[PDB]
């Protein structure tokens, strides 16, 4: 009854011939013995002649058509046959070596790679057959896609299938471990019959079959006077047309396993469902985050199930008496009846279906479902209109606006699904984010400024406070006060006397202002997050509901609006900034023109174009920063003049207004960048014809002087529209790539779960010893401040010993960064209360408590295999008596909460892999669609940021260059490699090359400038060596001689005397053409090698100045000739694997995938590690595109997308157990995820006892 394992194989001929239905005719006056037979299955309007069942009960029966004297090849195993033909001769049948056949080898006992030693010897000898009666040359038989036969390619002759059949059945059974054979090779052919499939895969198409027509074209050639080529072509174009052709849209068998629209991806892991709905969404204030408003047409159409049992039989009889029952399902007769008076007897197991009532859990969601907070299950409320009314508090969880977004609903009224919807998918259960712990729900745009202004309000009456509180003013206690403030309203709203560093003290908010970090969803300073860290998710969800009510009542009483007078009250400041900009940009233009004229008349040597662009870039960036500082001073002066400005109010509250946006409105628009640089010059050295040819105007390259208040001019509007349309094109081009990578990572990581012992496993491989490094849920775990050891601490010795144990890993990013946060196992800071030293717990007893708890936890919960010294370090530094004294019951409360989080939170079956994959995928999709990662160009080669770098990391491509970083304390060792590897050519040194003919010699003078040699950071001897190496090794030069003259301290004349190989005039012109480029040195790359420097960490207290260098390099071989001692070398992923190993490859993949997200995303460390430990779970790094070493089943590979998965499983006779999601969804099995992680039994002892 429970399917364990599935075995794939090939049908042999005795199972194909095992049929009493012989198909013989193509057309007939009566379809008997034809391919549309009535005994091959029940058609539309006829019972099955084999079984007597109709179309919905007959699953079809097989037939056979007789191919008389032909051996029809199975069309998809052709390549395997081709492989089997590269191992034997065809005139004899023997193998291509004498060592299989001798009586000294004993092929049954050799293990390992000794079986693979002999096979490339078999594929090395292709001269002639080795036996005494066959010395024919070894043919290379190929399947001809042109005409359908098998064709020899030494000479174009058709090799018949009856001879490949004889030579493939001639191979003995005990040579099958050599040639990768697992069954009879006669199962690769149809030797005497062809199977005719049942009608259930080809029903009668009705609108006013293709496979039936293809089988008719097969049976139209099944005659005794018929070639095997025409029958082979009919069989091939019935099975797979792309074997002999290159056309799509033919409905063949391979159409069910062809690409994205194949059968499994479209109809097995996804389907169209009944009891569904879809509608536009709108907000609702009478709907909390735990509810959803359903329109009347949906609840007038959708039905809910009421099961018949001993509890609900009176309700079902009452609903049947009042005609409220819409459907009735009789389980014992197994039939559904629509009630439009009939007779219905209600037995237990039957059900009725009535209209869907309130407080029923509907599963609703928004698309695209990027992460699990898109698809939740909340309670139905009856609302008005035709829109699904959601709360605004869930809107940021679903990336939803009310500007035309649609959401879908599904009703799954199965009792197990009802319980799982009520518990697991309820929005109270999903309050905290499962990676970084911040609340998923909260306040949005207007409620942020309402929260800010409600905190800032003062001197209210009791009636004004109760008007603001509304329905929550029932239990408000005025202690003895008559005048109140907004801080008292917030103290009432929080309702707990908890402390938090920087936010709370005895319930009062000790922060200066309440901003968007306090109330908006997914923020690190949320008050609802602290209230749910204190007690439970119900308290955080209650704070969110009550806070949203009170903020909207503040907006109802006081209002919020931003007018035009708040932005631009007069013309004074904008006129001042306009005059400032038109003064400074003309100063920039005159300075640049003075430099250009000093170059043009010749008083200075010119710069490179990169350095000139950098200088103008710095001047325009200084003008932009001057505009920013003017905008900031105007904001300060406006809020000290008009302190009730609503625009500056929503700027101070933390919603979408900053000095940069106000600079765009009131100041300047800046420099418009395309691909990191300005817009490139087209025809005539310019972009637009509004500027002169080769115009040095920086405003014509994309610098906009105007703002949105003044209005952009035509050229400025061109450059702004160029940036806008470039961003639109880039997000459209990147959306599908992000979706493809997201699906690949989700299918790779989805089978990785937390097992019953707190470990992270996939299949039977242990990935992590402890889930989330704590064996506690990631929503419970708290990133707390890392406190470095100070000698004023109590137990500085123990704290410094723990820091010496765990201090590695806290210095990372090529020693550039020091860790400021660590991972507390839970938010214990809300349970810490300060206490005077007379009432406090004793200091030694607090150490004994911390040490005993950490030792007991390390024994009992981590099984003495995990290092949890970070937990002891956190409890010793954050509960340190040198900075905080606590009571004894405070410490008891903290450690009891610690044991509660270790005991109850994390459970086996937690889908940690698909949660981490969805979080990573949602983040890089958001950063790609939001254009968060701006491209910027620099001199050195740098590691890129963003989605394409993440995809290059997970692709793990081999034959590509890597960025290899060399860090050294001394700069001489980096300079010796930088001189030899950096590309410098003669043409980039800006030379003055002139030649003249002379009797016996062509003489070329190369007058180079010495400042150009110093800007390249080489010497004159380097240039002499470059020219000498090119001329001394070139083919076109017959004789030469070089001399070096001094012309000035500004000029060096390299004089070459030459005679070229005849024809000397063409070789002269070719030499003069290739001379500025081919006289070069170093590895050719577009990036230079500048030696950077920074401050690197040895520890928190000791640093050192370090010199850095980056080289694009394929291998590591050419570095092996240098004195690279005491030099840190950071290669790419494959050189790190080939030198240091698989663990260093895992570490590089972790930190490199983390670095693509940018600054401020350290919480993505724990997902990325979980991805990297999946890519390096075998002995070699494996990509996300293929399954090479990981044990993946055939249905997993077919659901991932692999069209030849079941064919390769049938060739190798694979027998695989059904333990993965893709294999459980195929056979309608419950996956081993979550509640399905456990098997459930029923103990019938207590029922039989009574």
């Amino acid at each position: 009854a429970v399917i364990s394992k599935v075995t794939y194989s090939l049908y042999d001929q005795k199972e194909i011939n095992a049929t009493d239905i012989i198909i013989s005719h193509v057309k007939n006056d009566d379809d008997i013995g034809t391919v549309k037979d009535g005994r091959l299955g029940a058609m539309d309007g006829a019972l099955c002649k084999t079984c007597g069942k109709t179309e919905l009960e007959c699953f079809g029966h097989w037939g056979k058509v007789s191919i008389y004297k032909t051996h029809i090849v199975k069309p998809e195993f052709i390549s395997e046959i081709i492989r089997l033909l590269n191992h034997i001769c065809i005139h004899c049948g023997l193998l291509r070596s004498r060592e299989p056949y001798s009586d000294d080898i004993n092929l049954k006992e050799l293990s390992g790679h000794a079986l693979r030693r002999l096979k490339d010897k078999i594929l090395s000898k292709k001269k002639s057959c080795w036996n005494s009666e066959c010395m024919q040359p070894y043919q290379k038989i190929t399947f001809s896609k042109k005409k359908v036969c098998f064709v020899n390619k030494l000479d174009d002759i058709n090799v018949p299938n009856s001879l490949i059949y004889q030579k493939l059945i001639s191979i003995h059974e005990k040579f099958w471990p050599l040639l990768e054979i697992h069954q009879y090779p006669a199962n690769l052919f149809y030797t005497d019959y062809f199977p005719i499939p049942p009608l259930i895969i080809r029903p009668a198409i009705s609108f006013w079959n293709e496979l039936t027509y293809l089988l008719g074209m097969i049976v139209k050639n099944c005659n005794l006077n018929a070639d095997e080529q025409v029958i082979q072509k009919a069989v091939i174009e019935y099975d797979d047309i792309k074997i002999i052709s290159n056309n799509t849209t033919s409905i063949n068998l391979s159409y069910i396993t062809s690409g994205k629209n194949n059968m499994i991806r479209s109809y097995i892991v996804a389907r169209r469902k009944d009891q569904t709905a879809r509608s536009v969404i709108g907000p609702s204030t009478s709907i909390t985050v735990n509810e959803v408003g359903m329109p009347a047409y949906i609840r007038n159409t959708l039905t809910e199930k009421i099961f018949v049992n001993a509890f609900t039989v009176d309700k079902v009889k009452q609903l049947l008496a009042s005609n409220q029952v819409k459907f009735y399902f009789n389980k014992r007769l197994n039939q559904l009846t629509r009630i439009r008076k009939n007779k219905i007897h209600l037995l237990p197991g039957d059900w009725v279906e009535v209209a869907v009532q309130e407080y029923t859990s509907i599963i609703f969601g928004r698309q695209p479902s990027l992460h699990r907070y898109n698809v939740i299950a909340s309670s139905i409320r009856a609302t008005e209109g035709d829109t699904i009314k959601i709360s605004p508090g869930i809107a940021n969880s679903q990336n939803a606006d009310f500007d035309g977004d649609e959401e879908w609903m599904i009703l799954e009224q199965n009792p197990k699904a009802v319980i799982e919807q009520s518990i697991l998918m309820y929005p109270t259960t999903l309050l905290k984010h499962d990676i970084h712990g911040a609340p998923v729900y909260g306040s949005i745009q207007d409620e942020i400024v309402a929260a800010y202004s409600l905190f800032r309000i003062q001197d209210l009456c009791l009636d004004e406070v109760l008007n603001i509180l509304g329905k929550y003013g029932r239990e408000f206690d005025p202690k003895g006060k008559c005048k109140f403030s907004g801080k008292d309203i917030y103290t009432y709203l929080i309702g707990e006397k908890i402390n938090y560093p920087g936010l709370l003290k005895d319930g009062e908010i000790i922060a200066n202002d309440v901003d968007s970090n306090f109330v908006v969803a997914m923020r690190h300073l949320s008050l609802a997050g602290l209230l749910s860290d204190h007690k439970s998710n119900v308290e955080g969800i209650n704070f969110i509901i009550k806070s949203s009510y009170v903020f909207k009542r503040y907006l109802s009483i006081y209002g919020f609006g931003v007018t035009f007078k708040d932005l631009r009250p007069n013309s004074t400041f904008t006129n001042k900034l306009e005059a400032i900009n038109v003064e400074k940009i003309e100063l920039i233009k005159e300075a640049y023109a003075k430099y250009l004229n000093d170059v043009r008349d010749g008083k200075i040597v010119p710069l490179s174009k990169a350095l000139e662009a950098d200088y103008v870039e710095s001047m325009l960036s200084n003008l932009t920063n001057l505009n920013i500082r003017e905008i900031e001073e105007h904001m300060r002066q406006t809020l000290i003049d008009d302190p009730d400005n609503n625009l500056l109010k929503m700027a101070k509250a933390g919603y979408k207004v900053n000095p940069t946006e106000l600079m765009y409105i009131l100041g300047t628009y800046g420099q418009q960048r395309i691909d990191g640089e300005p817009a490139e010059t087209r025809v005539l050295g310019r972009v637009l014809p509004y500027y002169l040819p080769d115009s040095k105007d920086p405003e014509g390259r994309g610098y906009i002087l105007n703002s949105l208040t003044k209005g952009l001019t035509g050229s400025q509007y061109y450059f702004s529209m160029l940036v806008a349309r470039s961003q639109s094109t880039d997000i459209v081009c990147e959306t599908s790539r992000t979706g493809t990578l997201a699906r690949k990572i989700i299918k790779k990581m989805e089978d990785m779960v937390v097992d019953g012992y707190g470990q992270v496993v996939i299949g039977n491989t242990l990935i992590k010893y402890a889930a989330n490094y704590t064996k506690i849920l990631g929503s419970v775990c708290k990133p707390v401040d890392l406190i470095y050891p100070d000698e004023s601490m109590t137990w500085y010795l123990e704290i410094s010993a723990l820091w010496n144990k765990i201090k590695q890993g806290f210095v990372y990013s090529q020693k550039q960064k020091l860790a400021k946060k660590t991972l507390a196992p839970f938010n214990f800071l809300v349970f810490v209360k300060p206490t005077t030293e007379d009432n406090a717990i004793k200091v030694k007893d607090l150490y004994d408590m911390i040490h005993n708890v950490i030792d007991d936890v390390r024994e009992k919960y981590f099984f003495t295999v995990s290092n949890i010294d970070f937990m002891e370090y956190i409890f010793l530094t954050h509960l340190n008596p040198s900075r905080i004294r606590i009571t004894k019951e405070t410490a008891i409360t903290i450690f009891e909460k610690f044991y509660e989080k270790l005991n109850y939170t994390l459970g086996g079956g937690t889908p940690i892999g698909i949660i981490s994959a969805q979080v990573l995928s949602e983040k890089f999709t958001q950063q790609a669609l939001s254009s968060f990662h701006t491209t910027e160009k620099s001199g050195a080669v740098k590691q890129k940021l963003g989605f394409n770098e993440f995809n290059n990391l997970t692709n793990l491509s081999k034959n590509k260059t890597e960025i290899i970083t060399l860090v050294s304390d001394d700069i001489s060792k980096l300079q010796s490699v930088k001189i030899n590897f950096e590309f410098v050519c003669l043409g980039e040194l800006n030379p003055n090359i002139t030649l003249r003919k002379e009797t016996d010699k062509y003489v070329v003078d190369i007058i180079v400038n010495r400042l150009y040699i110093k800007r390249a950071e080489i010497t004159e001897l380097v240039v002499e060596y470059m020219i000498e190496r090119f001329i001394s090794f070139s083919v076109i030069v017959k004789e030469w001689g070089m001399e070096t003259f001094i012309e000035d301290e500004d000029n060096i004349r390299f004089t070459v005397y030459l005679n070229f190989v005849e024809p000397e005039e063409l070789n002269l012109s070719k030499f003069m053409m290739v001379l500025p480029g081919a006289a070069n040195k170093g590895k050719i790359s577009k990036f230079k090698i500048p030696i950077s420097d920074y401050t690197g960490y040895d520890d928190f207290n000791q640093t050192k100045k370090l010199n850095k260098m980056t080289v694009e390099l394929m291998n590591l071989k050419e570095l092996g000739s240098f004195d690279l001692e005491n030099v840190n070398v950071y290669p790419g992923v494959w050189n790190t694997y080939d030198i240091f190993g698989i663990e260093a490859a895992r570490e590089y993949l972790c930190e490199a995938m983390l670095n693509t997200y940018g600054e401020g995303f350290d919480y993505l460390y724990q997902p990325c590690d979980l991805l990297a430990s999946l890519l390096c779970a075998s002995y070699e790094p494996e990509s996300v595109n293929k399954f090479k070493f990981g044990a993946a089943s055939t249905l997993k590979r077919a659901t991932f997308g692999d069209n030849k998965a079941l064919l390769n499983a049938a060739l190798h006779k694979k027998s695989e157990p059904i333990n993965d999601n893709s294999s459980c969804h195929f056979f309608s099995k419950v996956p081993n995820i979550g509640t399905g992680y456990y098997k459930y039994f029923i103990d019938l002892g207590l029922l039989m006892r009574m």
């Binding site: 509890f311 509660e900 029922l1247």
Partner: protein, 103 residues
């Protein structure tokens, strides 16, 4: 020492989370919804006058829940888990069920 690790892991097996108690409640609710006999003390007709989630929770705390869960190679009743963990999860489940107006 391998026996000591086996004892520590057998003690770790008694932890209960939301997935296990949700699966136990879902199995007993699906069996009671299709017509199995409620195994509560004080079996009457009055017990068919209350709702079924009260019967499921009463079966859980009375120690007569028929559902046996197979975890880590062991067979566990709902009373073989940690009693404080069962209470901790059932308090939350009863709270959110009272918000849903079904308990």
């Amino acid at each position: 020492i391998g026996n000591h690790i086996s004892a520590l892991k057998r003690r770790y097996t008694r932890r209960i989370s939301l997935f296990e108690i949700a699966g136990i409640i879902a199995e007993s609710y699906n069996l009671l919804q299709r017509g199995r006999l409620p195994l509560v003390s004080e079996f009457s007709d009055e017990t068919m006058k209350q709702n079924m989630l009260h019967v499921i929770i009463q079966e859980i705390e009375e120690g007569s829940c028929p559902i046996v869960i197979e975890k880590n190679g062991e067979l566990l009743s709902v009373n073989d888990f940690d009693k404080d963990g069962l209470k901790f999860h059932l308090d939350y489940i009863i709270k959110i069920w009272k918000l849903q107006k079904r308990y």
